[PDB]
UniProtKB/Swiss-Prot annotation:
It comes from the Eukaryota. The Tyr residues in the variant tetrameric sequences in the RESA repeat are possibly phosphorylated (by homology with band 3). May disrupt the normal intermolecular interactions of the cytoplasmic domain of band 3 and thereby facilitate the invagination of the red cell membrane which is necessary for the formation of the parasitophorous vacuole. It is found in: Cell membrane. This is Ring-infected erythrocyte surface antigen.
Length: 21
């Protein structure tokens, strides 16, 4: 919603925890 808000949020959450833990 308004310049790809929904798609980009799920992509960044996935790698936040993939790379740290």
């Amino acid at each position: 919603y308004l310049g790809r808000s929904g798609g980009d949020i799920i992509k960044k959450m996935q790698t936040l925890w993939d790379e740290i833990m």
